[PDB]
């Protein structure tokens, strides 16, 4: 039985004959939408996916240092300049050094020096975006067997088939629903995250724009490259080592994400729907009424929403048969007061002692639940608020 132990539930009602209900849908919830002379129905939004996530940025957290130079000049000799200065794959740093008869200069003073180095990326982590075109909602529909559908904003029409109950139609999408205008899908090694735009755009590491192709073009390369202590013609260059833990410590919070495979699952939903169930058919109002008896194999327990779950066991060859199940204040005799959530219930196992669960919505105050008809019928008292 669905929505039995589910916390975030919502037993929203429906119209009988007119097939239009307001169905809000959240991630990891339930919407028990019953109806007319049609089987009660559970619509649950389970998954939210996003494929084709375009790369917004990539930060290098472990850099590699490559071929490096050092052009120096004597004082009053002008400024220095290297080959690969204008080269975008190189990071450089100009400075002035002590020059004299010691180094190899005739004059004493401050001589020019420029040092360059080629940049590489050992490991980079990537931030991807989330468009409403990406988003895709896998949704489960059960008889309260259960078919699963998928609504892509590019095709918001679905139709599921469930056993001898016919079919359920579905039509949704509320334009920009739970809109992830902000929020980036940040994948590091193999672990993923959902971080905020601003926090991502302000990360103290080298970075390039879109994907790759033929060598990116990291910016702010001197975030992982430090020019240390010149000499006259030689100034040193150092990389800062891998920065995995430095990121890990900063990302101890962000709402983690899972995926499989390349499709990224996110825990969020919201989706307004308008579905039609004309092709819904109970099953068979041609089943004969159950003649035998029952048993409270589980004591009539209350839900948190006010409804009552009830468990019976049928000792009869008679099945498949319709279960006589109702409620009454009169008891003599003997009309119904409340309603069935599990509307028009049916035992389908043939022999022998066949169990079944039921959900019912009792009237305010004292009422008695009745399972079976006439002789050997079960009754149980129940109060409501």
């Amino acid at each position, epitope marked *: 039985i669905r929505c039995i132990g589910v916390s975030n539930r919502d037993f929203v009602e429906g119209m009988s004959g007119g097939t239009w209900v307001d169905v809000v849908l959240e991630h990891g919830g339930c919407v028990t939408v019953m109806a007319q002379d049609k089987p009660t129905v559970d619509i649950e939004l389970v998954t939210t996916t996003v494929s084709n996530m375009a790369e917004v940025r990539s930060y290098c957290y472990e850099a590699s240092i490559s071929d490096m130079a050092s052009d120096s000049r*004597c004082p*009053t*000799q002008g400024e220095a300049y290297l080959d690969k200065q204008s080269d975008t794959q190189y990071v450089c740093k100009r400075t002035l050094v002590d020059r*004299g*008869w*010691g180094n190899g200069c*005739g*004059l*004493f*003073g401050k001589g020019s020096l420029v040092t360059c180095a080629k940049f590489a990326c050992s490991k980079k982590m990537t931030g991807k975006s989330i468009q409403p075109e990406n988003l895709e909602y896998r949704i489960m529909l059960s008889v309260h067997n259960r078919a699963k559908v998928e609504i892509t904003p590019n095709s918001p029409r679905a139709e599921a088939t469930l056993g001898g109950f016919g079919s359920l139609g579905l039509d949704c999408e509320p334009r920009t629903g739970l809109d992830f205008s902000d929020l980036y899908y940040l994948t590091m090694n193999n672990k993923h995250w959902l971080v905020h735009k601003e926090w991502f755009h302000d990360i103290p590491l080298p970075w390039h724009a879109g994907a790759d192709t033929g060598t990116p073009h990291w910016n702010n390369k001197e975030a992982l490259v430090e020019f240390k202590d010149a000499h006259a013609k030689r100034q040193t260059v150092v990389v800062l080592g891998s920065q995995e833990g430095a990121v890990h410590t900063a990302l101890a919070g962000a709402l983690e994400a899972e995926m499989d495979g390349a499709k990224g699952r996110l825990s969020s939903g919201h989706l307004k729907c308008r579905l039609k169930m004309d092709k819904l058919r109970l099953k068979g109002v041609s089943y004969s009424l159950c003649t035998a008896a029952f048993t409270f194999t589980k004591i009539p327990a209350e839900t948190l929403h006010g409804t009552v779950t009830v468990e019976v066991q049928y000792a009869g060859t008679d099945g498949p048969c319709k279960v006589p199940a109702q409620m009454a204040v009169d008891m003599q005799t003997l009309t119904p007061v409340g309603r069935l959530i599990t509307a028009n219930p049916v035992i389908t196992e043939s022999t022998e002692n066949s169990k079944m669960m039921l959900e019912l919505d009792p009237p305010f105050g004292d009422s008695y639940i009745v399972i079976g008809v006439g002789e050997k019928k079960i009754t149980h008292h129940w109060h409501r608020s």
Partner: antibody
Amino acid sequence: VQLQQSGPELVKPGASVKLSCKTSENTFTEYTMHWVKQSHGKSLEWIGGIDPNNGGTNYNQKFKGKATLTVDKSSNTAYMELRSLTSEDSAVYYCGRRDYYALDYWGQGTSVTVAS
Amino acid sequence: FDIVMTQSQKFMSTSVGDRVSITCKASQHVGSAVAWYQQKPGQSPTLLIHSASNRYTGVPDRFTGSGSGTDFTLTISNIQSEDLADYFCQQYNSYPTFGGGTKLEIKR
């Protein structure tokens, strides 16, 4: 001695004097000219230098204003001009040339006597 | 700033065939940017050692330079008559400065 310096000088106190030093008997302009004062008590003292290419000077702070080094490229003739002289400017002025190391080659010096 | 080069010995005596060691003490670190200069009386100074221990052309191996950091010693072995002169040190790490000078006297 690859360096010919000017002859001695007698200068009246106050007056200015220009000393000369000449070099280079081959096309090798990558060297430098420097000037060194030797006062009595045989104490040496670096006055300043000059690149004969661009003309890059470089004076000892002690001799800023007092000395002015200028170069004549084509003749390979370096010049050092003193000004507003006193008796404590009276000394032997050597000129030196750096090619590889420190003061690699010295002239015989120019004796400067500042007196009325 | 300026860098003081100190030679404690104003004078120093020796005879032919002996060994003398003049000491130059820089007040500040000048590494190996030190030169030495011989000046015979009447003549002009000449380069002997440079780089602090490497001797200049013509100079016999009797003349040995050494030292680093702040202290440098010019050592003359098998001293001859013609060796009498003034000996100067000179840092060229910063603005050139010379030592006070050390006169080598010969005894006989």
